[PDB]
Amino acid sequence: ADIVKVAIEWPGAYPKLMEIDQKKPLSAIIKEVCDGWSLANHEYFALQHADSSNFYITEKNRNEIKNGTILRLTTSPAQNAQQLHERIQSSSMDAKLEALKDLASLSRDVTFAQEFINLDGISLLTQMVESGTELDMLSFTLTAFVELMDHGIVSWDTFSVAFIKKIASFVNKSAIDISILQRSLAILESMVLNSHDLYQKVAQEITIGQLIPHLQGSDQEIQTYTIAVINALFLKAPDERRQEMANILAQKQLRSIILTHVIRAQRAINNEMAHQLYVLQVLTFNLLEDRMMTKMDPQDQAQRDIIFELRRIAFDRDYKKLGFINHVNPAMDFTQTPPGMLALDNMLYFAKHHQDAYIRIVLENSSREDKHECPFGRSSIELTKMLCEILKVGELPSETCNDFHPMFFTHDRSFEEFFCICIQLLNKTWKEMRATSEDFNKVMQVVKEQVMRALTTKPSSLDQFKSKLQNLSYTEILKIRQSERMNQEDFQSRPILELKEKIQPEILELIKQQRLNRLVEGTCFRKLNARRRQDKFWYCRLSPNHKVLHYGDLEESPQGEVPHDSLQDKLPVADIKAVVTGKDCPHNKEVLELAFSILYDSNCQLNFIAPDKHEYCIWTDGLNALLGKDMMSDLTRNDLDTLLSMEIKLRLLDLENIQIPDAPPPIPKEPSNYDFVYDC
Known part of the structure; x- marks a missing residue:
């Protein structure tokens, strides 16, 4: 169909109607037009939609050719360009203003973006920005600037670190309009995404103290923005630096703010934002994978001070009762990450968090010589690592998911809460199993299942999650699953x-x-x-x-x-x-x-x-x-068979409580009596 029918405009006419030979070029039939239109230099005139924002029609956008409307012929795009390279490049508030609203629109243009790179639009903006007398129309400026840098053809360095300080002011200014400072932010974080120096001096352009109130602003959008910003903040740093970073960060009771304006945002959270939060979570987490990565030096003593005094609190070979894997040196197990030092930290955490219940457990199973004492070092590291992976700590998500756990915001170390809850339900269901040291793993495994199925709760509160500990079934679950299985088996009986x-x-x-x-x-x-x-x-x-x-x-x-x-x-x-x-x-x-x-x-x-x-x-x-x-x-087959199930239940009803014929009785010979018996 190397043709397209069209009605055609011009200032001062009726529609030229072109079933453009598509096999005839853009510009060939263009000149056909413009010289069927006296538009001298037919090539000085480009074609958008006559209609809404009207982007030009190139190989692709002429691949984006369609039929059923009218189109906008105008100056060449570079013609348009130099025109604005006059108007905006003029202080003519009329010319600059109108043409600038226009250019902000256009900059969705990536072609003329290339073109305008070549008109050095950026120098123009950096000017109009660093230079407008306490500068609105500059909203157009940034708008354009945005969609340009968006077009990513852009290198970025030309935004001078000094012009960047201009930015650090623009933002450091009275927080500019949602549009304004928001997009500022956006590109900021972008340039971040580009390179090291950029991120660095961005930090050297910012404070968190800056960052903080802005998120304390209510705007889901504004938040989302500086949110993903701080996400990137932690994205790039050196952990060393990034430690002190996280330190100050939460040290702003940060999670409180999370809580109030986000968690306690009843006005919900952009699955965008919420996704950034998914992320933020992941990060906050992996921060610590380091310790999860940090193994042990058992030959050292200081750790043994740690562990002995802990045992001692828990009490006040010498470790035999202590039901590790090893009672001469279970410290070796923590020269193993996962978790390495991580599990020791956790036990300390349950302790100082719950020394009462803690030592309670300590002596709980370290005492019973039934088959139901607990492998303490074993169970510990087990829970530890199994979490980790169930969490997959130390990981990098993508923009994938917009979901999370507010329970892990229901405390800063809301893990260690989860940790101890797990140990609670752990011994608890251990005994719901009355397990023994071998089954342990499967227990853990099912425990994982548990938590998995418990996290199938998509719970919100660690204590709602203890309500979930409640909501648990010991074995009604496997009951449901393998029951569907065995009933399918039964129904498979021949008849x-x-x-x-x-x-x-x-x-x-x-x-x-x-x-x-x-x-x-x-x-x-x-x-x-x-x-x-x-x-x-x-x-x-x-x-x-x-x-x-x-x-x-x-x-x-x-x-x-x-x-x-x-x-x-x-x-x-x-x-x-x-x-x-x-x-x-x-x-x-x-x-x-x-x-x-x-x-x-x-x-x-x-x-x-x-x-x-x-x-x-x-x-x-x-x-x-x-x-x-x-x-x-x-x-789908699950469904099918569920449907099946009761359906044919109806047919069992046909002969309820009547014996199942597996060996089907045959059909005796048809009585030739077509002199029937009774009429009907």
């Missing part, structure tokens, strides 16, 4: 099995109907590299035809829905070829498991992100149905 297979297809069908509903409702989608206020999130709906998806756009937000229609709206469905998952979204890692690329006409396709494995299966399988394909996540 029981018979109609199972037969109906199970349309059982699945029912599934598929609901799937139909689902795909019609349509869901959000987190895009890729669509951070920084692009609809990374983007939702969906669908025509009951099922045949043109009517998809949409969203954002990673605090509160609720935001179904704002996008060009991510409409697409004929059955044309679609298929969908892949994971790797073939081809570019953390865990999101691969939620990555899946819907591919259709040859490359017209998209990589894709589900909001959950639920939604993964949801789309995957509903799609399967759309492609007449079978559904996969045997969660």
